[PDB]
């Protein structure tokens, strides 16, 4: 389901990192493969050349922790109306406490040592389940 239309009609888009995370913007290419692009430092914005009907998602460049773009999971550059570039506002999502806790423990603990903590084997698994873009793309294909 998830791949960029090769519409061949360009669209001037502003990636606006409105998050404390270093952002990795990810174009879904014509085969539906996630192709990474140059990372945005936090609170910075760049005006980029993309195409209508193309598909974009954004992740933490260091942990692939999932971010939002204009409130939602996926971004599709529309037509620039009045020569006014379209805005991709990349914010942090309201992570669950469990997911935010996981992020923070992962960020401190080397993956090897996850097994070397005093927590239920249920939570080791939750720790090892690093956010994956591919697994998420797979997850999102279904109804």
């Amino acid at each position: 389901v998830l791949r960029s239309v090769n519409s061949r009609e360009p669209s001037q888009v502003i990636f606006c990192n409105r998050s404390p995370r270093v952002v990795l913007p990810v174009w879904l290419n014509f085969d539906g493969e996630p192709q990474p692009y140059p990372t945005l430092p936090p609170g910075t914005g760049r005006r980029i050349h993309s195409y209508r009907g193309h598909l974009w998602l954004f992740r933490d460049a260091g942990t692939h922790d999932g971010l939002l773009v204009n409130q939602t999971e996926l971004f599709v550059p529309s037509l620039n109306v009045d020569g006014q570039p379209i805005f991709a506002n990349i914010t942090l999502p309201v992570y669950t406490l469990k997911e935010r806790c996981l992020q923070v423990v992962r960020s401190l603990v080397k993956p090897e040592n996850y097994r070397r903590l005093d927590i239920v084997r249920s939570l080791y698994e939750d720790l090892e389940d690093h956010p994956n873009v591919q697994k998420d793309l797979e997850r999102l294909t279904q109804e």
Partner: protein, 103 residues
């Protein structure tokens, strides 16, 4: 702007929000509904400095950028029935030492 607060007397901690331009007296009204002591029986401290009722919370340095939902600013409460008690805010628990593998 909105401001988010822990109003704290001894063990009791109270999470509440208000606007920067709301007053310290409106904050004493909040405690009245909850703890059933009138505003004249209360004394509000910012770090043990007594606060004037007439003053707005933005005047007292409780801004949106200090009193955040994720990191609310503490407000100390003292009750009266002859004189006002010493501010005694009982501290939260001590986090144990980091396991070797988080250091």
């Amino acid at each position: 702007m909105d401001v988010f607060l822990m109003i704290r007397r001894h063990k009791t901690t109270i999470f509440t929000d208000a606007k920067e331009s709301s007053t310290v007296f409106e904050l004493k009204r909040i405690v009245e509904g909850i703890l059933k002591r009138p505003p004249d029986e209360q004394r509000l401290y910012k770090d043990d400095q007594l606060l004037d009722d007439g003053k707005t919370l933005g005047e007292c340095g409780f801004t949106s950028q200090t009193a955040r939902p994720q990191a609310p600013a503490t407000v100390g409460l003292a009750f009266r029935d002859d004189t006002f008690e010493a501010l005694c805010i009982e501290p939260f628990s001590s986090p144990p030492e980091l396991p070797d593998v988080m250091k």
